[PDB]
């Protein structure tokens, strides 16, 4: 029986390890190698039993059932279940009124699928910089990026933090633009107590197994505010001939998962909150900024490096980041980087080939993008560390404290962090 069951419990870490040598310098790591793995998704007996219930039902009924259940929970008037997050955004865009040739304002920082959804809608991504703290589409930018071709604005609730809907909404009503959300990380994230996915004219959302609310593989769902949008999206499926339908197997996993989502979410919130509070005592690290009205889902926990410390006088931020990755990794905290390159510099938006012959792109004026156009997004990539699976998983107290100790341990070694960083090779 091949099982993922972790056999060794994480011991309660000794708080004296704050004073320990760094693992990169032969010290004992805060997290032993045995305790490094997390489990995701949380596959419980319920999920297995739910597969034995659903297998006996018409496949399309299972899909309907899931769609309805999740829809009701979210509080969205209308919902179409898809085969993927990416297809749901495609449908979210078309249904809301985006037509071939229109420009959609998207942030430069998000998953490629965001922008690929726009290109599939035969529209033109207009990339924009982010806010230094929320990491979401900067509303202050938007004025400059508007043209006669601008039809929609597509904010991403990236990391699971809700973007500045209050502002982006007013901009859209004012300039007669639609608002389409990418809520693919913001399962259960709220703003003013209302869930992400319900603010926009439409919205799309990954329900892939790597998301806080995971379905059984690949899956997504599109939400619509008005019936007109829902109808246009359904019409588009008839005309286009695309088969964007969800698998019952995928949805069955969602049905069971949804019953326990609130429990796992509660652990995520309390865990993430404790870490924010603890990192606020440190000189080196800061957890994500959260506006007062917003609740973060914490699909990813991005940590700001205070790179302006005196110990780091003549050291590029990127070296501070790479030094901290190595240092943290040896301690047993896997702090990768989510996206290394901004979407305007990914090959699809360099070759601008689209459907072939550069189909979508040649409808509008070409804007040659340059790194100087996205200062805040690059600032973030140079100066932040991302925890993904470590805090997406609803880890136990012992693991959370292990994280806290690790950051506190490194925070006492600002001097060594400076030294290690300074000795890193130039890029």
């Amino acid at each position: 029986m091949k099982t993922d069951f972790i056999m060794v419990p994480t011991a309660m870490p000794d708080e004296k390890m704050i004073n320990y040598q760094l693992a990169i310098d032969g010290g004992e790591p805060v997290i032993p190698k045995a305790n490094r793995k997390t489990i995701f998704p949380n596959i419980a007996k319920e999920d297995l039993f739910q597969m034995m219930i659903s297998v006996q039902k018409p496949e399309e009924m299972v899909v309907s059932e899931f769609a309805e259940k999740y829809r009701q929970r979210v509080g969205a008037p209308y919902a179409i279940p898809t085969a993927s997050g990416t297809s749901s955004l495609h449908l979210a865009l078309v249904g809301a009124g985006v037509k071939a040739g229109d420009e959609v304002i998207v942030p430069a920082f998000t998953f490629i699928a965001t922008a690929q959804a726009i290109v599939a809608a035969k529209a033109i991504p207009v990339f924009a910089d982010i806010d230094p703290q929320t990491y979401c589409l900067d509303p202050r930018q938007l004025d400059k990026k508007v043209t006669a071709r601008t039809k929609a604005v597509m904010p991403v609730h990236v990391h699971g933090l809700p973007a500045d809907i209050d502002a982006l909404a007013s901009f859209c009503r004012q300039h007669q633009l639609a608002l389409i959300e990418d809520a693919s990380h913001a399962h259960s994230a709220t703003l003013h107590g209302r869930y992400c996915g319900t603010f926009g004219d439409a919205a799309g959302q990954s329900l892939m197994a790597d998301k806080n609310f995971p379905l059984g593989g690949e899956a997504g769902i599109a939400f619509f505010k008005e019936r007109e949008s829902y109808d246009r999206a359904l019409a588009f499926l008839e005309e286009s001939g695309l088969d964007y339908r969800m698998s019952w197997v995928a949805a069955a996993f969602g049905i069971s998962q949804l019953d326990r989502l609130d429990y796992y979410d509660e652990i995520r919130q309390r865990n993430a909150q404790r870490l924010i509070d603890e990192l606020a005592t440190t000189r080196l690290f800061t957890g994500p900024m959260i506006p007062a009205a917003a609740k973060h889902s914490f699909n990813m926990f991005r940590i700001k490096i205070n790179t302006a410390l005196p110990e780091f006088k003549d050291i590029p931020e990127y070296k501070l980041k790479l030094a901290l990755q190595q240092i943290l990794n040896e301690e047993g905290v896997f702090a990768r980087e989510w996206q290394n390159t901004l979407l305007p510099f990914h090959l699809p938006f360099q070759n601008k080939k689209g459907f072939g012959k550069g189909y979508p792109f040649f409808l509008g004026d070409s804007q040659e993008y340059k790194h100087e156009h996205f200062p805040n997004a690059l600032q973030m990539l140079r100066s932040t560390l991302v925890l993904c699976r470590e805090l997406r998983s609803p880890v136990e107290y012992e693991k959370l404290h292990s994280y806290i100790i690790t950051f506190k341990k490194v925070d006492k070694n600002i001097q060594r962090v400076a030294e290690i960083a300074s000795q890193i090779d130039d890029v």
Binding site: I43, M52, E59, S84, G85, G217, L242, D243
Partner: protein, 188 residues
């Protein structure tokens, strides 16, 4: 057809904890791909979560893209539309882009004869097995294979440049169920 067989496999994979296509140590899609290569004697397999994926993978696989044309002759009304969406037109002078076989529970048992056909691209719609939408593209044309995977976000990212992309990644869970069917219907 057997509730136990389907349940058992879904149980097995769920117990593995490996249910993502992009995850390392994910053998269900590879296992499926092998059987279909063996049965067809083809060198390259590309799984999709939609017939639409396999259709695009075949068209763009041979640089039949927006503006181009091929022989929309043996197409159903749906694939007629897909092509109209993709921008492709019709001409009788040109050859057909693929030979599509809808696979179901009746004709699955004798799949070797169905696919023992010399053609550029074999497309297999598995949707009607009732595990969810799924298709597989088979070829020896390495350039089709590579172009087909690359239209999928996360397919060979784990100098053939991609343009537009879709999530046509298939669910291991689904892929596992079809893999079982093939084995239970005698395709070692």
């Amino acid at each position: 057809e057997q509730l136990f067989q389907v349940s058992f496999v879904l149980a097995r994979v769920l117990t593995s904890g490996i249910i993502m296509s992009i995850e390392k140590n994910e053998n269900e899609l590879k296992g499926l791909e092998n059987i279909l290569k063996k049965t067809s004697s083809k060198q390259y397999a590309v799984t999709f979560n939609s017939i639409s994926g396999a259709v695009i993978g075949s068209l763009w696989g041979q640089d039949i893209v927006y503006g181009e044309a091929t022989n929309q002759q043996s197409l159903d009304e749906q694939q007629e539309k897909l092509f109209k969406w993709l921008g492709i037109g019709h001409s009788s002078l040109l050859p057909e882009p693929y030979t599509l076989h809808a696979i179901n529970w009746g004709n699955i048992s004798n799949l070797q004869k169905i696919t023992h056909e010399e053609a550029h691209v074999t497309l297999l719609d598995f949707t009607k097995l009732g595990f969810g939408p799924c298709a597989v593209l088979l070829t020896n044309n390495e350039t089709i294979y590579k172009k087909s995977e690359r239209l999928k976000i996360f397919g060979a990212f784990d100098e053939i440049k991609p343009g537009l992309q879709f999530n046509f990644r298939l669910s291991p869970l689904v892929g596992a169920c079809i893999k079982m069917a093939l084995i239970k219907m005698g395709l070692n």
